Amino acid sequence: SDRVRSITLGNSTITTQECANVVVGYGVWPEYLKDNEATAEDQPTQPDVATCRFYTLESVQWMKNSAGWWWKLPDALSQMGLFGQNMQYHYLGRTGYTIHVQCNASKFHQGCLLVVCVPEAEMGCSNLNNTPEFSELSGGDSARMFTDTQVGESNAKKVQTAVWNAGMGVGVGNLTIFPHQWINLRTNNSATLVMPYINSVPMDNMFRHNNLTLMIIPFVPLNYSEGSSPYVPITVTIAPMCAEYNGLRLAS
Amino acid sequence: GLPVMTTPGSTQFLTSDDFQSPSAMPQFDVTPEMQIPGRVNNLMEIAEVDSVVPVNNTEDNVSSLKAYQIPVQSNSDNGKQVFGFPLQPGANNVLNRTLLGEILNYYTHWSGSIKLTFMFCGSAMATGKFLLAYSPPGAGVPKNRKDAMLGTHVIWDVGLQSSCVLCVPWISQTHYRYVVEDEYTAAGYVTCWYQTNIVVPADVQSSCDILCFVSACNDFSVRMLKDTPFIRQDTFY
Amino acid sequence: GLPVMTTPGSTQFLTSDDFQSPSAMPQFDVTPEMQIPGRVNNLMEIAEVDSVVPVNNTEDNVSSLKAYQIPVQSNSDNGKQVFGFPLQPGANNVLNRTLLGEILNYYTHWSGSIKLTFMFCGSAMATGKFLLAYSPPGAGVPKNRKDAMLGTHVIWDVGLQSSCVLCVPWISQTHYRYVVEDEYTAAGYVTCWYQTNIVVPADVQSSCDILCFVSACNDFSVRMLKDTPFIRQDTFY
Amino acid sequence: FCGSAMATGKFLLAYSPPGAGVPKNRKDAMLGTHVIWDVGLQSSCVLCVPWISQTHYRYV
Amino acid sequence: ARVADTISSRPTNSESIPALTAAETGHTSQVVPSDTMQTRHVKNYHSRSESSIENFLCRSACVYYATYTNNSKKGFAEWVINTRQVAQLRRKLELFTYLRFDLELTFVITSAQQPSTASSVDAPVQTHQIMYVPPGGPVPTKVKDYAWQTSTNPSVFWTEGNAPPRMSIPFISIGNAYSCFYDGWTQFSRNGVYGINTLNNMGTLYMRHVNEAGQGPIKSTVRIYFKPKHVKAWVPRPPRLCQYEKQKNVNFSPIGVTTSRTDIITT
Amino acid sequence: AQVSTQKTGIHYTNINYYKDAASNSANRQDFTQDPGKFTEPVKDIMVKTMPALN
Amino acid sequence: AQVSTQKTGIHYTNINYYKDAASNSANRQDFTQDPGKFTEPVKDIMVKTMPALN
Amino acid sequence: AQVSTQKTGIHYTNINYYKDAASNSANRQDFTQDPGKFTEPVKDIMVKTMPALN
C-alpha cells in the first residue's frame, strides 16, 4: 500500500493515510554547501534541529467563489521560532524546503486544486507605470488571494491579480512545468513537495529576495449538496531543510 | 605573398554562420561553474510535460478558469457527444497555446505520436464509462457513436484510478507534417462520447467536470526553425 | 590561385587585437639586457604594500598633513567612537586615493580580503585599549559599542608592539564585487571605539595620534580593465 | 476516533515543556513537540511524550 | 540523437493496465502507442539535433538601432546595454530562468544625405568609431572630447564599404549565471526599485563620426546584433502570453487564454 | 587539427587560431538527453504496468 | 608550428612568418609572481607568530 | 585531406571546411551505367542470335 507516509523532522511528525507520491524537486535532494562552491570564507552555523522542523501557517477557507492564494516562501517563516531569529542576526543563508498542503472532505464533495512551486515569480502592477509595493506582494504567514476580476488602473501600487494570467502574464494551464501535485477530493487528501536550493549564487540575503512562491489554484470549484458541511479549510506546513548562515552582525 | 583568389560569398553577413572572431577582452577569468538544479539540454524535454488544454472556449469562457473544464451531466438518453476538435497541434486554437503547441510554433515540420490524458474531477460516489476515439482523415467527422467506434478508440471505466491515456498513433503518408494549416497534411479528429450514463446517489451533485492534458511521446521531433506569430512590436520599449 | 572567402571582421581596427606585423627597421641589434633591481611582473605586487589612509578629511585638513592623523584624548565617560567609514575601496573618498584604491580604479571587478594596520604614535608612558570592528550589511551602522561587538572585532592592547592588524574577511554572496558604488554589492562598515581610557602620567601630553594603513591579502584579484576617472585634458600639452 | 465511517478530520497533538506558560494558540503549540494525526482507516494514533528533565527522577 | 523505434505487439488479455494511471502524483505517464493497440516494427531514423539549446539560441538577432548626425552640435549616440527593448529576443531568452553564454557582436552601419544648400557636394569615405565604456569610467560629453582617447576602453574603427565589424565577448558576470527574472529589491529596507533593474550593470556603447562636416550634413544609423555561443540553461519557464509594455518590469494588461469558437463540438 | 564527422542524413578539419577559448566556434554537436528530471520527479519509482496506487 | 594551451575558465596553433623577433605577437601568458622584494625587504627574516622586537 | 585523380584526356587535394554535408562541392565523378532496366525490361532473357518467337 503506497497510500501511507510518515515524515519525521526534529521533534515533529506528519502522518497521512491517503496520499499520492512525493515529488522531489528536479530530481535533487537538499544538501549542505561543498568546499568547491563556497565563497564566504568564515565558518557557517548549522543549528539543524532548532530550525529544521515543521512550522504551520494560518488556514484559509475554500469557498465556492474562490480564486486562489499565494505565499512568498522565505517571508512567511520570518517570525517563526528560531528560524526567524537567525535571519535577523545573519547576512547570508541558504535553505531547502519541504511543503505539505492538506485538505480533507467527504465522499460527497468535489473539487480540484493545483499546488505548484514557482522559482523567481516576479509579479506585475495594475498601473502600467509603477511596480507593486511590499504590503501587497507578501504577508506575514497570511495568504494573499487572487480574484476573478481585473484590478482597475485607477489604483497606483497594487498587484494585477487576474487568475488566468497567474499574476505574471503567462497562461495558467502551463504552470505544470514547475514541480507540482494535484489534490483531487475524489482520491487525494494532501500533497508533498521537496525543493532544493535554487539560485544563481551560492548564498543570498533572505530579506531582500524571495526565491520561491507557493500557489494554490482551484481549477474545478468546490461543490456539495444541501446538508453537507459548508466549511472546508486548507492548511500549509513548511519545514526548512539543511539550513546554514553566515555573517553575524547586529539585529537589523 | 601566397597567391589566393576570393569566391562569391565574401564580405557578407549571414545571420546563421559559424566562424571564429577575435576577442575584445583578452585573458579574462570567468566565474567558475556551479551545480544549479534543472538543466535543459534539449527542447523536447519541455514538450514532453503535461499541460491543461482549454477545450471549452465558447465565446465567453476565455477570460476565466472555465475554459479548462468539460461539463458532464446525467442524461435521459444514450450516445451523446461530450467534445470534439480537429488534431492540429499548431494551427487549431484549442491546442495552440499549450506547452506542446508553443514549441511547435517556432518550427515548421513535426513528426511523432501525441498523448492525451483525461482526469475525472467528480464526486467519489459517481460512476461512468466513456469512449475516446480518433478518426484519420478521408471521410468527414463522425456524427454518431456508431461511426466513431470504427476508428481507434479506448473505453475508459472510471473507478479508483482517475486517469486514462489515449495515445494518438502516427498514421501518415509522409515522414513529416506541416505545422501551419494544410489540407494535404491533415491529421484527423478527436471525439468523446457517452458509453453509459453518469449514475449518482442521492444528496450528490449530478454535474461533474473533466480535465484534459496533452504531451508528446518519445518519438516526437521537430525541424526547420522559424519565428513565432504570437508577439508584436511597434516601437522600442 | 587558392580559393578563399573573406568573413565579417575584415579591414577593421580593434584596439586590443593580437596579430603580427612587418618590421619597419629590419635586422636591428638591440642593446643587451641589464639586471636592474626591482622588476614588476604583476600589478598585484604594488597593491599589497601598505599606504597611509586619510581618515580625517573634515573640510579643511585636506590641504595639510593633518588628514592622516586620528585624534585621541582622555575622556570623562566610556564607549565613545573614534572613527568610522564604509568599506568601498574604489568609490568612498577615504580609501579612494591610496595605493590599493588607485589600482582598483583601472578595473571593474574585485575580490579578496583587505588588511588594516593601526599604529599608536603617542608617548611611551600612555596606555589604552581599543576595539576595531567590522559589520556586514543588512542592518545600518552601529551606534554603540554594544552593537559593534556583535560583528567581527579584535581588541587591541597598546604596549611595546605598537601595531595591530584587523583582517577584513571576504563575506559576499557572489564571487566578485563592483568597484563603482552599487547597493546590490555593498560591503559594510568599519568602526573604532574606546574599550578603556587613555591613562597618562603627570607632565605628559594627553592628546595622542593614530596612523592607519591599508593593503591587500594574497587572495586579492581584479578583472575587466577600464579607464580611470582621475585625469582630465582639454588641449594637447 | 469513535465517529462515523464517512467523517474526516485532522488534529494536532502537542506537548510543551515548562518555563513558559500554557500555549493559547495553535501557533504557540506547534513550536513544541507535536504530531499531526490524519483520521482514516487506521483509527488510532500515539503521541509519545519523551523524557525531558534536568534530573534523573521526578516527584510524584 | 536518434529517436526510439516502434516495437511489434500482440493481442493481450491480462492484469496489466498501461492506459490507467493517476495524474495526481505530478508524474507524466510513460506509455508508448505499442501498449494500447497492435503495432508493427518500424525503424526510426529521425534525430533531435535541431531542437538543442545550442541550435535554438545561436542565431543573430537585432537588439537596437540608433542614429547620429554629422552637422550637429553634440551629434553622437549612446546606448545602455540590455536585451529587453525588442520583443522577439526577449521572448526566446525568457523561456529559462538562468543562462550562461559567450557573445558575438556585429554592427551594420549605413548613411544618408541630408538636404544641404551648397552646390557641388562631394564627400569622401566615412569612418566611424564605436566605443565601449565599462561602468565607472569617464563618458564623452561631446564629439571633440578627451574621452575618445580609448587608452584602455576597447573600441573599433571601420571604413564604409567593407565587411561588417565583429568581435567576441566572454561570459562577463559577477554571479554564476545571468538572471532573466529577479524577485526582490535593491535596498535592505524594501523600498524603491523592484525587479530586474537591480542586476543590470553592463556599460554603455558610444558612436560617432571620425571625419569632419565638409560641405553637407550626413545622418548615419548603426544596428546591433547579438549571438549567444556556448550556451547552458536551467529551470524552464512558461512562455509569455500578454504583450510587453515596458522595459524595466513585467507589467501587462490581462487577455484571454486562447481565441474562441462557437461550440464545444465544432470541428 | 581536429578531424570530426560532419553530420549527414565524410570528415572535416578544424584548427583554432586565437588564444582565448571564447573565440572558438559554436558547439552545435552536443546531443544529450535527460527528460526524466522533468517528467518523473517522484521519490518511489513507478512501473508502467502496475497501478499507481495500491 | 607551436601548439599551446588556450586559456579557459583545448589547443591552438601558432606559426611565425617574419624574420625579426620584434614582429611576433604579444606574450600574454607569462604568469610569474615575486611580491617578497617589495613587501618584505628586510635583512633578518621575520616569523609571523613570533614578536617583531625581542 | 582527400587526394583524387584529376580527369585528363596528376592529382589534386581537397579538404572540407564546414560541419554540414550539404556544404560540400559537387560530386562530378560518379560514372555508373545501368541501361538494361530501360532497354530490356522483359521477364525471360533474349539471346541476340536466336529468334524472338519460337
Ligand SMILES: CCCCCCCCCCCCCCCC(=O)O
Ligand atoms: C566594442 C566592444 C563592445 C563590447 C560589448 C560588451 C557588451 C556586454 C554584453 C552583456 C550581455 C548581456 C546579457 C543579458 C544580461 C541579463 O540578462 O541580465
